[PDB]
């Protein structure tokens, strides 16, 4: 009920972060501003 999701950037689509969410609380894919190292600045990140 707590699966491990990975978070991919919007522009370069690299996979930089893995984390846990609750699936009966949040059905849709998360969005966070995290730090993409290949871009050098904070970008948006959905799930896969």
């Amino acid at each position: 009920v707590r699966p491990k999701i990975t978070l991919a950037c919007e522009v370069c689509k690299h996979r930089n972060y893995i984390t846990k969410k609750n699936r009966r609380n949040d059905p849709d894919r998360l969005e966070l501003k995290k730090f993409c190292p290949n871009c050098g600045k904070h970008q948006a990140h959905r799930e896969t």
Binding site: V1, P3, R23, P27
Partner: protein, 550 residues
């Protein structure tokens, strides 16, 4: 070679799967019929094939240059016009590039003269791709076959259930090579389906229908695709061949699982009581109980709660008095010179084709209209309950519980204080399935939701308007054996001719011809009498239109 194909496709939430291991493939010209219960995934397979969603595993691969159409279970439109409803899709790669050919030829001379050779002739190239580009004389060809509304009026509340006749003309003009028509025969007539019968027969291209009618499934379809709840199984033959081999399959499956359930109980006590029996082997025999008990719970599905209509006040002796009513619009002549009482404790049926005015007649009774020259007496003991044809009380963003309860805790239904969450699961939403949005609900659970916010008053005068749509035979029988046990005045508009033969006591019906198009005949008795009274009083007791050049 294959129009459409699937790998190990599994569209699902990880808590609740809706497709699982769907491996099959289709040919060109594959007329398919899809059958199954509600809650299987019949519309979440036709949604992958038109690219409107993506699976969570497995590749869904259309062919190279074959385009696909779709008609969803609710048809969207645009709010512009009616002849706009034949240019958006369908003729959309010709019409948008039709005025531009008339725009590039406005005879500019200072701008460009010899650049009319690589763009105006290129637009001349694409008109030959369609083999016809006048587009006008062959567009009344597409609306004098569906019997469309007059093309110069917007699709506001002006359109009733012939909204579907327009959406069966955006789709059947594109002529896709894979045609995903999901329940086309909602809200249609005794002849609007009869047109669609002969049109889907001689149709070059594949066809997937999720229909329930019998002329398509017995004569047009060649493959039948059963959808079990997550599974998918193809079969070959028409629907008469399907149900015979389905019957002998569920025969030997009915005692496949009897001796399975007998086995689990015979070695239930072997693993629970008396664990003294064997040492250091017991962790190898205990797992064979769990490996058959975890597959005994993947077909344990028999939990189907009944549709129940609550009872409120005592209904008196007068319910609906219609005092020589006329109703119509500017130039239009619907209901004219009609007078009828409404029988206490009796199911009332309404008969008429699309465009006679059946659902406006209930809007008079609740109060959403006003009669032109007439009056309707309500009677101070009745209580209305109006479920609409267009299902307009569904707000497709907020969740299921918030549509029917308005965020409250107790709602007022049967002169009691019912806890409003318990009133939700009474129509089939167990627990954590309140929390999912109503715009994505199934065709059963959008018809098991419109009965929730409209039977919320316990009224002894309920006005059912298209109740027999998108629900299977387990609920359709559980409806008709639940509005017989209701103490008064259920009034039903329907088109399922094998529904009014079950549950009817009175019939209001249209009988108009070329003297006046707004007659309404009243009858005392069931549908198995009106079909015999009609042939002995009137004389009215084909020639198919092509929709294209050929």
């Amino acid at each position: 070679e294959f129009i459409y194909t699937m790998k190990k496709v599994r569209k699902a939430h990880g808590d609740k799967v809706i497709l699982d291991d769907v491996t099959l493939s289709f040919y060109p010209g594959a007329k398919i019929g899809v059958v199954g219960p509600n809650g299987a995934g019949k519309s979440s397979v036709l949604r992958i094939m038109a690219g409107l969603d993506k699976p969570n595993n497995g590749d869904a691969f259309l062919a190279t240059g074959a385009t696909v159409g779709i008609l969803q279970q609710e048809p969207p439109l645009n709010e512009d016009k009616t002849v706009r409803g034949n240019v958006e899709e369908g003729m959309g790669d010709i019409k948008i590039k039709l005025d531009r050919f008339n725009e590039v030829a406005e005879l500019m001379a200072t701008d460009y003269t010899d650049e009319l050779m690589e763009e105006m002739g290129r637009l001349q190239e694409e008109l030959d791709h369609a083999d016809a580009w006048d587009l006008d004389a062959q567009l009344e060809q597409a609306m004098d076959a569906l019997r469309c509304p007059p093309a110069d009026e917007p699709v506001t509340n002006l359109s009733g259930g012939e909204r579907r006749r327009v959406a069966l003309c955006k789709l059947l003009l594109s002529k896709p090579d894979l045609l995903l028509l999901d329940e086309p025969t909602n809200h249609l007539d005794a002849e609007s389906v009869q047109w669609l019968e002969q049109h889907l027969a001689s149709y070059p291209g594949a066809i997937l229908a999720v229909t329930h009618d019998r002329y398509f499934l017995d004569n047009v379809a060649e493959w039948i695709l059963e959808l079990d709840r997550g599974r998918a199984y193809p079969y070959e033959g028409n629907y008469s061949t399907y149900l015979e081999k389905k019957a002998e399959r569920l025969a030997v499956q009915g005692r496949k699982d009897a001796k399975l359930q007998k086995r689990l109980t015979e070695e239930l006590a072997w693993v629970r009581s008396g664990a003294k029996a064997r040492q250091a082997k017991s962790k190898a025999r205990l797992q064979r109980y769990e490996e058959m008990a975890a597959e005994a719970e993947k077909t344990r599905k028999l939990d189907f709660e009944e549709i129940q209509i609550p009872v409120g006040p005592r209904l008196g002796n007068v319910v609906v008095e219609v005092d020589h009513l006329d109703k119509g619009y500017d130039g239009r002549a619907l209901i004219k010179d009609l007078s009828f009482s409404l029988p206490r404790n009796g199911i009332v049926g309404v008969i008429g084709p699309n465009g006679v005015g059946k659902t406006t007649l209930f809007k008079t009774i609740v109060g959403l209209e006003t009669p032109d020259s007439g009056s309707v007496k309500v009677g101070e003991t009745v209580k209305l309950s109006y479920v609409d044809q267009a299902r307009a009380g569904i707000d497709p963003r907020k969740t299921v519980w918030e549509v029917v309860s308005d965020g409250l805790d107790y709602i007022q239904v049967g002169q009691t204080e019912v806890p409003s969450r318990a009133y939700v699961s009474a129509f089939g939403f167990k627990g954590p399935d309140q929390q999912k949005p109503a715009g994505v609900l199934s065709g059963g659970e959008r018809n098991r939701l419109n009965l929730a916010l409209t039977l919320k008053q316990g009224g002894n005068l309920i006005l059912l308007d298209e109740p027999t749509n998108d629900l299977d035979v387990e609920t359709l029988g559980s409806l008709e054996n639940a509005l017989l046990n209701f103490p008064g005045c259920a009034v039903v508009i329907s088109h399922d001719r094998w529904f009014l033969d079950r549950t009817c006591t009175h019939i209001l019906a249209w009988e108009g011809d070329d003297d006046n198009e707004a007659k309404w005949f009243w009858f005392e008795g069931n549908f198995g009498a009106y079909e015999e009274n009609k042939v002995e009083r009137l004389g009215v007791d084909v020639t198919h239109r092509k929709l294209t050049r050929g």
